[PDB]
Amino acid sequence: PQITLWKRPLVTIKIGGQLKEALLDTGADNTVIEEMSLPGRWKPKMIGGIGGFIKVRQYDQIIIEIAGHKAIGTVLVGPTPVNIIGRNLLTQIGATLNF
Amino acid sequence: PQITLWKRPLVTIKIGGQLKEALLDTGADNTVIEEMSLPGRWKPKMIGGIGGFIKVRQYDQIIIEIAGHKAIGTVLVGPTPVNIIGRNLLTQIGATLNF
Ligand SMILES: [C][C]([C])[C]N([C][C]([O])[C]([C]C1=[C][C]=[C][C]=[C]1)[N]C(=O)O[C]1[C]O[C]2O[C][C][C]12)S(=O)(=O)C1=[C][C]=C([B]([O])=O)[C]=[C]1
Ligand SMILES: [Cl-]
Ligand SMILES: [Cl-]
Ligand SMILES: [Cl-]
């Protein structure tokens, strides 16, 4: 699609067989999702947002579908106000900014 | 242009007679700029993201040139770690996300 920005660019994602709502976020290096159960081992990561730095759990090689497009990559799990799809997965689905 | 997302989508903006680097951020409702002076009236506001909330000054009807395109709208000024061009101005330059 071509998504305009008059409203939040929310899409449906599927991760662990569950549907969730998430925000397509070019200002996010990383994909970060609210607390949920994911398989495998995780690693610690610190990410800095507008209000400061937080600790999250980094899971690699996670299968995730974004607005119908299959991706497999790193997902951070932690206290984010909304699920955000960052550039690490936007690149996998071929997303660009255009004007 | 067409901006790939392998790296942060940083562009040069002109605001209040100063040049700054800023992120084209589809995840941001509003444009948020690091501390600077702007003319006219303002009111305080609180905005929240990852890491919590920060207090900002809200200036309305501010002109910004974004990668050579002029837009006008509200600008929030405060202790953001990165200058963010949010949807309120991304729409004005005709920016879309495409995949
Ligand atoms: C979280 C989003 C729902 C809203 N944010 C916009 C995001 O794009 C934000 C932008 C950003 C980028 C760098 C540093 C700080 C912030 N990136 C972000 O946190 O990314 C994290 C995950 O990847 C990492 O890489 C970048 C930081 C880490 S926000 O800045 O908090 C915001 C909130 C309210 C309003 B308003 O007008 O009400 C406007 C903006
Ligand atoms: Cl990844
Ligand atoms: Cl506006
Ligand atoms: Cl339009």
Automatic annotation (TrEMBL), chains A, B:
Gene Ontology BP annotations: proteolysis
Pfam families for this protein: RVP
Subcellular location field: Host endosome, Host multivesicular body; Virion membrane
The keyword Protease appears for this protein: yes
UniProt-listed CDD domains: HIV_retropepsin_like (cd05482)
Alphabetized UniProt keyword annotations: Aspartyl protease, Host endosome, Hydrolase, Protease
Coiled coil stretches, renumbered: none
Membrane topology, as annotated: Lipid-anchor
One Gene Ontology term of the molecular function aspect: aspartic-type endopeptidase activity
Domain annotation Peptidase A2: ranges: 20-89
Gene Ontology CC terms: host multivesicular body; virion membrane
Protein name: Protease
Gene that this sequence comes from: pol
